[PDB]
Design a protein around this ligand. Structure first.
Ligand SMILES: *[C@@H]1O[C@H](CO)[C@@H](O[C@@H]2O[C@H](CO)[C@@H](O)[C@H](O)[C@H]2NC(C)=O)[C@H](O)[C@H]1NC(C)=O
Ligand SMILES: *[C@@H]1O[C@H](CO)[C@@H](O[C@@H]2O[C@H](CO)[C@@H](O)[C@H](O)[C@H]2NC(C)=O)[C@H](O)[C@H]1NC(C)=O
Ligand SMILES: *[C@@H]1O[C@H](CO)[C@@H](O)[C@H](O)[C@H]1NC(C)=O
Ligand SMILES: *[C@@H]1O[C@H](CO)[C@@H](O)[C@H](O)[C@H]1NC(C)=O
Ligand SMILES: *[C@@H]1O[C@H](CO)[C@@H](O)[C@H](O)[C@H]1NC(C)=O
Ligand SMILES: *[C@@H]1O[C@H](CO)[C@@H](O)[C@H](O)[C@H]1NC(C)=O
Ligand SMILES: *[C@@H]1O[C@H](CO)[C@@H](O)[C@H](O)[C@H]1NC(C)=O
Ligand SMILES: *[C@@H]1O[C@H](CO)[C@@H](O)[C@H](O)[C@H]1NC(C)=O
Lengths: 50, 18, 49, 49, 192
């Protein structure tokens, strides 16, 4: 499991056909193994902080 | 404007199929 | 432009910079077909519209 | 600036034939002429082109 | 001028046209809508932006809106008969006022005395001008995204003749020779 905070509004930057600076210098998802990228809202009641 | 003499009949005799 | 009167420009015999187009805008979504933004940025074309 | 609009209808002739845009094309001059003189309330305006 | 009533015709453009020249190199007016002039009811008016291809060899190619002059023997006048050419653009300006122009280029092609072909087609990238072996090759593209529906031959005086043929979505077999030219072709649906 890989995880980080990331605006939902930017989900298109973090995407399969893109090559933005979001992908090139930060997170480049691997596709050699089966995987799933989940975009979710985590409430502070769960203990998540930022 | 320039005056034109329009006489369409003249341009039939030059018909040649291509 | 409006959608009923949208603009079109065709680019030929020039060098393009797609980073320049994208660095100016906030991308909400993209829907590509037989191409990806990554490839769109680096390929050679007979024309770009 | 200005009004941003789209055509909701553009039928013509006695058969009410929809003047539909073909892929890669645009609204025809009759449709643009019509729509730009149409009310913005979605009402059908009739004219001759 | 000594002319025929070519200006009264708005011939369907269809998909495109090809022209056999043989040699006044032909002048064309092309556009999306065709009808009559409101003053004299003569056929030959184009509406909105019109494409004018006027050879003078270099092609003067313009995409302009036409506003016909109202002086004597002009398209906006009761005694009007027909416009004609005798630069080509200056003769057009005697009959029409050219306004709202979005395009104007001059193509130096460099044609010879021999037989010549010229063609016009239109797609999503604009109007494509072809010229000639007798094969047609692309020489220019014009940024017109308004579909052309009609074309008109503009009468000229100085004989010479040319032929205009429509293009269709036909299937052809094309035979290329050692020099890379198409020397023969088969129009598959022509005969057995
Ligand atoms: C393509 O365009 C980008 C702009 O989107 C150019 O990158 C900029 O380069 C200048 C220096 O000339 C920097 O000050 C900017 O901060 C850079 N902006 C970004 C977003 O990186 C890039 O150099 C151009 N590519 C080429 C080959 O010219
Ligand atoms: C396409 O051309 C037609 C005909 O010239 C234009 O219709 C005229 O538009 C002017 C300006 O608004 C009016 O004053 C005239 O009365 C209209 N004439 C007719 C017969 O309708 C039309 O507006 C042009 N369309 C576009 C998109 O340019
Ligand atoms: C979110 O966390 C707050 C603060 O703990 C809590 O009051 C609230 O009920 C939580 N809401 C949801 C949808 O979990
Ligand atoms: C042009 O002139 C010919 C006469 O040779 C006539 O038959 C034809 O109908 C005329 N065309 C138009 C559009 O007036
Ligand atoms: C032009 O005028 C003639 C009558 O002389 C008419 O029959 C024809 O339909 C008119 N053409 C257009 C496009 O209005
Ligand atoms: C030409 O375009 C201008 C707007 O740029 C407009 O005001 C004018 O009425 C147009 N003229 C014609 C003949 O279309
Ligand atoms: C045509 O020739 C003239 C004069 O030599 C030149 O200025 C112009 O750029 C040329 N245009 C083309 C398309 O070759
Ligand atoms: C083309 O085919 C002919 C035989 O019909 C041959 O003589 C000629 O050398 C070939 N040319 C090339 C470029 O292959």
């Amino acid at each position: 499991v890989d995880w980080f905070a990331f605006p939902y509004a930017w989900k298109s930057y973090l995407a399969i056909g893109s090559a933005d600076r979001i992908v090139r210098f930060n997170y480049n998802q691997d596709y050699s193994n089966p995987s799933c990228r989940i975009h979710s809202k985590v409430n502070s009641s769960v203990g998540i902080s930022y | 404007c320039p005056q034109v003499d329009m006489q369409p009949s003249y341009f039939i005799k030059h018909n040649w199929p291509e | 432009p409006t959608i009923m009167q949208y603009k079109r420009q065709v680019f030929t015999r020039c060098n393009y910079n797609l980073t320049l187009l994208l660095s100016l805008v906030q991308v909400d979504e993209f829907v590509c077909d037989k191409i990806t933004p990554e490839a769109l940025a680096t390929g050679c074309y007979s024309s770009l519209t | 600036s200005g009004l941003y609009s789209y055509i909701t209808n553009c039928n013509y002739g006695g058969f009410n034939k929809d003047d539909v845009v073909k892929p890669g094309g645009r609204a025809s001059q009759p449709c643009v002429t019509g729509a730009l003189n149409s009310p913005t309330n979605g009402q059908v305006w009739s004219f001759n082109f | 001028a000594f002319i025929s009533n070519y200006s009264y015709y708005g011939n369907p453009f269809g998909d495109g046209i090809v022209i056999r020249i043989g040699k006044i190199y032909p002048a064309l007016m092309l556009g999306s809508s065709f009808g009559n002039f409101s003053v004299n009811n003569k056929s030959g008016a184009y509406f909105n932006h019109t494409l004018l291809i006027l050879p003078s060899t270099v092609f003067q190619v313009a995409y302009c809106l036409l506003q016909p002059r109202t002086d004597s023997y002009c398209p906006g006048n009761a005694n009007y008969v027909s416009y004609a050419l005798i630069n080509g653009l200056e003769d057009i300006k005697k009959y029409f006022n050219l306004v709202n122009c979005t395009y104007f280029e001059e193509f130096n092609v460099t044609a010879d005395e021999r037989a010549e072909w010229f063609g016009i087609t239109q797609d999503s990238q604009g109007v494509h001008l072809y010229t000639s072996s007798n094969n047609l090759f692309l020489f220019a593209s014009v940024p017109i995204y308004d579909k052309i529906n009609y074309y008109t031959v503009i009468p000229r005086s100085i004989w010479a003749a040319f032929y205009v043929y429509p293009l269709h979505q036909l299937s052809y077999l094309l035979n290329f020779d050692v020099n890379g030219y198409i020397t023969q072709a088969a129009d598959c649906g022509y005969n057995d």
